[PDB]
Amino acid sequence: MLLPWLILIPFIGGFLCWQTERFGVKVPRWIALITMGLTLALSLQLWLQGGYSLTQSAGIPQWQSEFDMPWIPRFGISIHLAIDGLSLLMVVLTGLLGVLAVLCSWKEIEKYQGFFHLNLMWILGGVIGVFLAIDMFLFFFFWEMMLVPMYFLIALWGHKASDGKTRITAATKFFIYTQASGLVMLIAILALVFVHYNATGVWTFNYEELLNTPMSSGVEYLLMLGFFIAFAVKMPVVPLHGWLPDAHSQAPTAGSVDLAGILLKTAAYGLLRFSLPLFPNASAEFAPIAMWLGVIGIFYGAWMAFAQTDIKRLIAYTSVSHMGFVLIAIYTGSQLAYQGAVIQMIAHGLSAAGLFILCGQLYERIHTRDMRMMGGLWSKMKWLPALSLFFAVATLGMPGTGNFVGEFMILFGSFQVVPVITVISTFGLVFASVYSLAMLHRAYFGKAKSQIASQELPGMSLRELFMILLLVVLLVLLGFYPQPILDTSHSAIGNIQQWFVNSV
Amino acid sequence: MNMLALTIILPLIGFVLLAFSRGRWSENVSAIVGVGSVGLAALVTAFIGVDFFANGEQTYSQPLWTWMSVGDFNIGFNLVLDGLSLTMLSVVTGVGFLIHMYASWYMRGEEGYSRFFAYTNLFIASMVVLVLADNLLLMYLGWEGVGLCSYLLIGFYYTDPKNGAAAMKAFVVTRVGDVFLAFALFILYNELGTLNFREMVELAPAHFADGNNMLMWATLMLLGGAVGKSAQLPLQTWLADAMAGPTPVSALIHAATMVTAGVYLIARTHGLFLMTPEVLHLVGIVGAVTLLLAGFAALVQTDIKRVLAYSTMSQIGYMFLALGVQAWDAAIFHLMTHAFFKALLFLASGSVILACHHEQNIFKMGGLRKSIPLVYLCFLVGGAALSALPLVTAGFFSKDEILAGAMANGHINLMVAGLVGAFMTSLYTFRMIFIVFHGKEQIHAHAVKGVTHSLPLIVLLILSTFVGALIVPPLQGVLPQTTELAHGSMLTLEITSGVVAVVGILLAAWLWLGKRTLVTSIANSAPGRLLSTWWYNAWGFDWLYDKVFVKPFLGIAWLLKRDPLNSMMNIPAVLSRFAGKGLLLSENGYLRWYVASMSIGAVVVLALLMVL
């Protein structure tokens, strides 16, 4: 019921901001803040009003709210929006990140600003629609239309048409690397539906009847690779992640909040929801390749993070290290491991968003991007580097932050299922420390005479500090007290694991 | 009595105030609030200590809230206040109180003030969490909680980058130990299910009827965690570099706070180490080989702070032996004495290096008895206890008891190790004060007089002596494995240690009382410098631990300065663009070749149809 409205407010707000662009220029900032407030209101209403602590073994079909509507009846394509417990965590996270995106874009007036915000709400609404998606075509359409408006963001707002490096390399690799694999998973969807159409005799694009379709061995394996390729180019996996640092280092850091904190979520959401239950034996065969790619991703991202000299590419290469833990979590037979991935995933978004906001904040203070050029700014800034120290501290497994409990319950479940690949995996924490300290010492520890421009520094406004203070206190409560959201996700995680166990 | 969290909340909450009053407060109000947090901690500790005496040595547990709970994974914020944990709380909330009360006077006059009293409270709060935890998880929060605080205090002076760069080697090395520590944590949950210490104690023999081979992996890798955090051979790197910070943080790190986490883990899991005897004796094996390493490196270099540091390494491993010889209460008795002397010994040295005014040398000062005898009596009291002197010392009873226990274990190599350690402690006992305080004062050390540090000096003077040895720590509330006692040979071993201490003290005084030309000759002899260079490398261990992984790590980072796999999956675009350029060059514009294209399409279509 609430789901059609909850995916449509982003699109309605873009229309109204661009409508009132003719009326005024200070309107869309204040319009956008209220519209994202309504998005979190409906999302938090579903958290509180709904039975978040529901039955742990109520089957694979279980939803607090559900919407159905005929869209293309010839294939049974329907607007099958349906919200689960873990999907509701995803919706509340993106509503909060949308508030941060529209708050960081405050006091940013240009030649056109309504165009920026209709695009801003369009891309955030696309991610919400992926998170509420049970029909395969609706899932794919939303997956691919959140991908078009970021291209305009990197192009027309990466820099205003002055340098050609903001389109022809950064934005173009971002677009092609995702869309080729999106078309791969579309033909994977179609091969799965056609083998189901031979089995039963109905053209259906719905998840519940495609869940248990009879397929011979050696056939569903190729479709599982087809799903995983599109789910491995969106979250950074080892062979195909070259788009991520270019995308984050060129887009404005509000666009980078969208590009890191929430676009990385949807691929592991799809690995939990759409790839694991549909292909149980194929995923059981593919598991060790996934573990090898996971350990390679953690070690690889940390080394590339240590070796880099700038900051946006630095945090962009932390992200590929973080997601390796999540991939190994998903491809195991443990309930605790999956519940560790969820808390690690929410904390991943919350620990990347603050760093990107602050890195963009530091650049507009000093007008210099290279990290090794500055140094010793602690005597000049009064609140930026202290808050930045805790966010760099929250990146690695420091307890009292959500990242520690996240990565570390994965390791418990991972050692429960398989010893040797887990005992390799744990060493990324040592490597997490070295790139964390490298960031901290090269940027803030030292003498302010490392740069001439490090001798005249501005002040920090109240609202940026307010939205940084909220994230640090929110992230500490998730580290100390993670029970409420684990009780929320228990049943959804449990039935996925029980199906992955029982179907093999 | 429902006041355990006040030993954590009251410090920790004070940190938050000083983390946001970033220098905007004045000197006095900041000083009072920083000392009062730890002062309230000691008072609440004393109340529960005297109530623990009123409890009849009965443990008191308090669960605040469950941390995380999955249907087979139950972790809760459980705090256990038993005899072993009360003693380890007593050391921290007294020593941190005394060290931090000195810092109320030492820190003033320079910037970074509210910052330093912020991170000290966090440092103390993390150490209290480790020794009161009831679950191995919550205790893990303690381990890397205090590690991050050591990073924030070793690299406290961020201006010059030497001490600003020395902290991360400790940070890297302590997280290697924490990976080693968490490895055993995974194995214990896989094997025995529950991580509570007591439920683990009477669940371990029930689950272990059939298979035992994998428990040595759990316990050996658990041991690898304990050793690294404080000091030991396989990971002894950072304690020389930890001296680059200020004097009060060196006392907190090295004396009794952070280095007393690896002792608490072995002692708390003593029944768990009793489940396997060979992993228990292996602690003493590694302890016996580190007393041979950690001693004479105090003599080698001319840095006073490196002197006090190699002595701490020697003493911590001396404990590991004491725990390896199944003398548990005696080892904590050694800790109860050890905290008192080391903290004062470190602190007094700081007062005089304030008076030295940038000397940092042991060979260019002399005749300091006439400058101020207060620091003279401070080193003196510390030296006597360390050397195992029988004259009104505090720690000599602890050395006598553990060697009695060690010979009750019956390992002649361990008594040989104990005998050479007593001789080696007496060597570097008075050599430092004889080379520094005796001679001629060509650079005057301007002594500073003030009651603000004199009163804690008197308190530390009356506590570090044998008056403080009369305070028996609570050890009857845990009922550990009983430290065995020997009679008849107790007086024989007592006089043997006294003779060994006296011979070492007389040899140092004979080194002093000579011309020192032979000392200069052995400090100039080429085999002497070879051994000095060899133990500059400290058995090559820092040499080995740098050149085994560091430059390979820098080499692979230099090979990863440009990202390989992003480039090697760009070759589809490279091949497509170059092949597209070739196809564009294949077009001509001359219309004869267009018609030739039409004929050559007809030829291939007919050929392709005739092969079908």
DSSP B279-292: HHHHHHHHHHHHHH
Size of interface A-B (CB pairs under 8 A): 112
Nearest CB to A240 within list B66, B178, B569: B569
Distance of residue A446 Cα from the nearest chain B Cα, in angstroms: 5
Nearest CB to A239 within list B66, B569, B570: B569
To test the contact with chain B by mutation, choose from A296, A298, A401, A412 the residue with the greatest count of B C-beta atoms within 10 A, namely A412
CB atoms within 10 A of CB A22: 9
What are the chain A neighbours of B19 within 8 Å (beta carbons)? 386
| Identity of residue B11 | P
8 Å CB contact between B141 and A400: yes
Dist CA A497 CA A91 (whole Å): 22
Documented resolution in Å = 3.6
8 Å CB contact between B302 and B363: yes
Residue bearing tokens 């990073």: B151
Dist CA A241 CA A12 (whole Å): 33
The Cα angle at residue B388 between residues B382 and B393, in degrees rounded to 5: 55
CA distances from A268 to A183, A260, A336, B378, B424 (A): 18, 13, 16, 62, 60
Distance of residue A305 Cα from the nearest chain B Cα, in angstroms: 9
**Which DSSP string corresponds to B389-420?**
--SS-STHHHHHHHHHHHHHHT-HHHHHHHHH
Nearest to A10 by CA among A97, A112, A109, A136: A97
To test the contact with chain B by mutation, choose from A55, A174, A377, A437 the residue with the greatest count of B C-beta atoms within 10 A, namely A437
- CB-based burial label for A151 (10 Å; 0-12, 13-18, 19+): middle
Dist CA A369 CA A379 (whole Å): 19
End-to-end C-alpha distance for chain A, whole angstroms: 35
Cα dihedral sign, A410-A413-A416-A417: negative
Element (H, E) at A356: helix A335-366
User: What are the tokens at A68?
Assistant: 């159905």
Dist CA A258 CA B178 (whole Å): 34
CB atoms within 10 A of CB B70: 20
CB contact (8 A) between residue A399 and residue B569: no
To test the contact with chain A by mutation, choose from B12, B24, B73 the residue with the greatest count of A C-beta atoms within 10 A, namely B73
User: What are the tokens at B258?
Assistant: 């952070």
8 Å CB contact between A224 and A275: yes
What are the chain A neighbours of B164 within 8 Å (beta carbons)? 441, 445-446
Dist CA B127 CA B257 (whole Å): 7
In A, minimum Cα distance to B24 occurs at: A382
Nearest to A349 by CA among A7, A132, A95: A95
- CB-based burial label for B202 (10 Å; 0-12, 13-18, 19+): exposed
CB atoms within 10 A of CB B233: 18
CA distances from B124 to A150, B37, B39 (A): 48, 10, 12
CA distances from A166 to A123, A171, A346 (A): 19, 7, 30
Taking each continuous run of H as one helix and of E as one strand, the counts in chain A are 21, 4
CB contact (8 A) between residue B187 and residue A445: no
User: What are the tokens at A9?
Assistant: 């407010």
Distance of residue A6 Cα from the nearest chain B Cα, in angstroms: 31
Residues 6+ apart with CB under 8 A from B595: none
Residues 6+ apart with CB under 8 A from A119: A14, A149, A152, A153
Which residues make beta-bridge pairs with B73? B70
Strand, helix or coil for residue B525: coil
User: What are the tokens at A171?
Assistant: 């934005």
What are the chain B neighbours of A408 within 8 Å (beta carbons)? 182
CA distances from B35 to A361, B121, B454 (A): 36, 9, 17
Per-residue exposure over B165-187, b if at least 16 CB sit within 10 Å of its own CB, e if not:
bbbbbbbbbbbbbbbbbbbbbbb
What are the chain B neighbours of A335 within 8 Å (beta carbons)? 70-71
To test the contact with chain A by mutation, choose from B68, B174, B185, B220 the residue with the greatest count of A C-beta atoms within 10 A, namely B68
What are the chain A neighbours of B182 within 8 Å (beta carbons)? 408, 411, 426
To test the contact with chain A by mutation, choose from B70, B77, B135, B163 the residue with the greatest count of A C-beta atoms within 10 A, namely B70
Distance of residue A236 Cα from the nearest chain B Cα, in angstroms: 12
Residues counted in chain A: 504
Dist CA B261 CA B132 (whole Å): 11
Instruction: Identify the DSSP state of A400.
Output: T
8 Å CB contact between B341 and B381: yes
In A, minimum Cα distance to B147 occurs at: A398
User: What are the tokens at B298?
Assistant: 């105090």
What are the chain A neighbours of B165 within 8 Å (beta carbons)? 441
User: What are the tokens at B495?
Assistant: 């006089």
CB contact (8 A) between residue B186 and residue A429: no
User: What are the tokens at A263?
Assistant: 């676009």
Nearest CB to A426 within list B144, B161, B183: B183
Nearest to A410 by CA among A391, A429, A436: A429
Element (H, E) at B315: helix B304-324
Strand, helix or coil for residue A233: coil
Q: For chain B, what is the radius of gyration of the CA atoms?
A: 31
Dist CA B487 CA A314 (whole Å): 66
Nearest to B73 by CA among A415, A396, A53: A415
A162: phi > 0 → left, psi -120 to 50 → alpha, else beta; which?
alpha
The Cα angle at residue A97 between residues A372 and A7, in degrees rounded to 5: 145
Nearest CB to A307 within list B71, B178, B561: B561
What are the chain B neighbours of A239 within 8 Å (beta carbons)? 565, 569
User: What are the tokens at B259?
Assistant: 């280095």
What are the chain B neighbours of A399 within 8 Å (beta carbons)? 140-141, 144-145
Nearest to A119 by CA among A3, A39, A28, A244: A28
8 Å CB contact between B541 and B237: yes
Which residues make beta-bridge pairs with A65? A83
Nearest CB to A434 within list B172, B187, B566: B172
Residue bearing tokens 């290279």: A370
| Identity of residue B559 | L
Which residues make beta-bridge pairs with B61? B80
Residue bearing tokens 């969290």: B5
Angle between helical axes of A335-366 and A85-104 (0-180°, round to 10): 0
What are the chain B neighbours of A398 within 8 Å (beta carbons)? 144, 148
Dist CA B116 CA B19 (whole Å): 9
Calculated CA dihedral for residues B256, B257, B260, B264, nearest 10 degrees: 130
Dist CA B141 CA A493 (whole Å): 27
In A, minimum Cα distance to B558 occurs at: A307
Residue bearing tokens 């993070």: A305
Task: Indicate the pairing of strand B73-81 with strand B60-70.
Answer: antiparallel
Instruction: Identify the DSSP state of B253.
Output: I
| Identity of residue B439 | G
Nearest CB to B186 within list A393, A411, A483: A411
Instruction: Identify the DSSP state of A83.
Output: E
Residue bearing tokens 């409508």: A19
Nearest to B329 by CA among B211, B481, B223: B481
Nearest to A50 by CA among A31, A64, A32, A71: A64
Residues 6+ apart with CB under 8 A from A153: A116, A119, A120, A123, A251, A252, A255
CB atoms within 10 A of CB A53: 12
Nearest to A195 by CA among A203, A207, A183: A203
In B, minimum Cα distance to A176 occurs at: B573
Dist CA B553 CA B547 (whole Å): 10
User: What are the tokens at A133?
Assistant: 């998606």
Dist CA A95 CA A399 (whole Å): 26
Q: For chain A, what is the radius of gyration of the CA atoms?
A: 22
Strand, helix or coil for residue B77: strand
8 Å CB contact between B307 and B435: no
Instruction: Identify the DSSP state of A232.
Output: T
Distance of residue A195 Cα from the nearest chain B Cα, in angstroms: 31
CB contact (8 A) between residue B182 and residue A376: no
Dist CA B418 CA A458 (whole Å): 62
User: What are the tokens at A485?
Assistant: 């959201």
To test the contact with chain A by mutation, choose from B67, B158, B163, B238 the residue with the greatest count of A C-beta atoms within 10 A, namely B158
Residue bearing tokens 């350690």: B421
Dist CA A81 CA B81 (whole Å): 53
B516: phi > 0 → left, psi -120 to 50 → alpha, else beta; which?
left
CB contact (8 A) between residue B165 and residue A441: yes
8 Å CB contact between A98 and A41: no
Domain that residue A337 falls in: 1-504
Element (H, E) at A65: strand A65-66
A214: phi > 0 → left, psi -120 to 50 → alpha, else beta; which?
beta
Nearest to A492 by CA among A342, A325, A280, A304: A342
Dist CA A163 CA A266 (whole Å): 32
Nearest CB to A335 within list B70, B140, B168: B70
User: What are the tokens at A146?
Assistant: 């959140």
What are the chain B neighbours of A248 within 8 Å (beta carbons)? none
Cα dihedral sign, B601-B602-B608-B612: positive
Calculated CA dihedral for residues A290, A295, A300, A302, nearest 10 degrees: 130
Taking each continuous run of H as one helix and of E as one strand, the counts in chain B are 28, 2
Q: How many domains does chain A have?
A: 1
CB atoms within 10 A of CB B453: 22
Angle between helical axes of A462-480 and A402-417 (0-180°, round to 10): 30
Dist CA A43 CA A41 (whole Å): 5
CB contact (8 A) between residue A437 and residue B183: no
What are the chain B neighbours of A412 within 8 Å (beta carbons)? 73, 186, 189
To test the contact with chain B by mutation, choose from A445, A472, A489, A491 the residue with the greatest count of B C-beta atoms within 10 A, namely A445
User: What are the tokens at A45?
Assistant: 């209403």
8 Å CB contact between A260 and A271: no
CB atoms within 10 A of CB B355: 17
Dist CA B201 CA B199 (whole Å): 5
Which residues make beta-bridge pairs with B75? B68
Residue bearing tokens 């929110």: A474
| Identity of residue A328 | I
Residue bearing tokens 């190994």: A328
Strand, helix or coil for residue B133: strand
Nearest CB to B73 within list A336, A400, A427: A336
Dist CA A260 CA A234 (whole Å): 10
CB contact (8 A) between residue B565 and residue A242: yes
